[PDB]
Structure 1
Amino acid sequence: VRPRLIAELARRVRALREQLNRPRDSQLYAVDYETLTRPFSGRRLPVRAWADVRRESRLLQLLGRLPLFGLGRLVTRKSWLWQHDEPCYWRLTRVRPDYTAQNLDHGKAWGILTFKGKTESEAREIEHVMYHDWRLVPKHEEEAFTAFTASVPYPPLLRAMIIAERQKNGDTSTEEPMLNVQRIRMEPWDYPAKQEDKGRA
């Protein structure tokens, strides 16, 4: 068998060069409000976020106006609080801005979160940081805002099949078959995801 070395060489070189000089998060997140197109991509924004990007600012842009980017300060998911009346927030623990930015308006930061008062005992990562859908809640009116408080039949053919099965088995079991639905935790769309799972240009 004949080996091949230039393939591995080019692979290693490309990996090193891209991990060295990857595009900056601030650079590839920057948006021009005149045309609404991200540089380095030439792609247009969605109609639902057009106005949000035109008007509202970004997470780090908001957090740049207070020391240390406000450790523990109230930042709430505008989308969550417009989709549901219940309060939802982010217990931001760690922060790291991108220094290449002039206004320091981009970076990575996260901690514990809560959804409908459901606290999580793990400081996991935020989702959709670069959106212009971030609203800062001051420390006044804080506790008032943070205040917070069977089974289904089987399908007809499936239950008929189980009926025939247990009839051949011999048991009567006139009870209608059922499954647990409270165990099935149907999760709303807005439940966050893991950033590291999704890649990056």
Structure 2
Amino acid sequence: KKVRPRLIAELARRVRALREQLNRPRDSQLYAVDYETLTRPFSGRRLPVRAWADVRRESRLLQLLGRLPLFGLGRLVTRKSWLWQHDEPCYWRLTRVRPDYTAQNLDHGKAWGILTFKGKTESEAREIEHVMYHDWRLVPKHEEEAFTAFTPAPEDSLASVPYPPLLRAMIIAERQKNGDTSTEEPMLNVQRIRMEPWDYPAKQEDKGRAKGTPV
């Protein structure tokens, strides 16, 4: 019951982990795109057909900010996909930028900011996702005041919905079995559940990265 040690599986494991940390591909290599074949040279994978239009027009976040004094600190950057879908102002306030220095035009990197989705600001600044996407647009200084202008509409909405028929029938039978007599309806409290949109910025600080396997 004394397991025979496997040393080569631990030596290799350390070496592979080390190489992934010293040969790791940058954002310039991973997120490069050939604009004629619309493929990622690093992996040779075609983009989806719905993105092709926007990969030839819009700009990446840090090919807008690389033209600014401090990578556009304290500035609002919206996204084309938000402006079409949502009338309300959605934007990020930039607070920290980590540019990719291996790009010749400094057009890749990371960004942290304060989200304001549909006019609702967030307490603290987190990391921005979809930096690589060709969907961004920088809010001009003089328009910053008319773009941010927002008036909250009433949020009154349904607070309770019925139970589905069978469950409701089983909730009214326990009452009468225990002896409780009431004419009130069983209702679900749907006020706790805050249904967010499907295009709500997720967390890029819990998201993975492509492995260093160039093709």
Q: Same fold (TM over 0.5)?
A: yes
Does the 8 A contact of 2:77 with 2:136 survive in 1? Answer: yes
The 5 A counterparts of 1:115-194 are 115-149=117-151, 150-194=159-203
Residue-by-residue CA offset, 1:40-85 (whole Å, 9 max, x unaligned) = 1110011111010012221101111221111112201221221110
Q: How far has the Cα of 1:196 moved from its partner?
A: 2.6
Distance 1:164 1:171 in 2: 10
The 5 A counterparts of 1:21-32 are 21-32=23-34
Three-state SS of the structure 1 residue aligned to 2:113 is strand
Name the stretch that deviates more: 170-179 or 151-160: 170-179
Q: How far has the Cα of 1:102 moved from its partner?
A: 0.3
Does the 8 A contact of 2:32 with 2:42 survive in 1? Answer: no
The 5 A counterparts of 1:54-73 are 54-73=56-75
User: Runs of 4+ in structure 1 displaced over 4 angstroms?
Assistant: none
Identity of aligned residues (%): 100
Q: When the two structures are superposed, what TM-score results if normalisation uses the length of structure 2?
A: 0.91
Q: How far has the Cα of 1:107 moved from its partner?
A: 0.1
Structure 1 residues 102 and 146, CA gap change in structure 2 (3 angstroms)? same
Name the stretch that deviates more: 64-73 or 129-138: 64-73
Residue-by-residue CA offset, 1:91-145 (whole Å, 9 max, x unaligned) = 1100011000000000001121111111111111111110000011110122111
Ranges in structure 1 where 5+ consecutive residues have no aligned partner: none
Residue-by-residue CA offset, 1:128-168 (whole Å, 9 max, x unaligned) = 11000001111012211101112100000000000011110
Distance 1:122 1:73 in 2: 16
Three-state SS of the structure 2 residue aligned to 1:92 is strand
Does the 8 A contact of 2:112 with 2:126 survive in 1? Answer: yes
Q: CA RMSD in A?
A: 1.0
Q: Kindly indicate whether structure 1 or structure 2 has the higher relative contact order, using CA contacts under 8 Å at least 6 residues apart.
A: 2
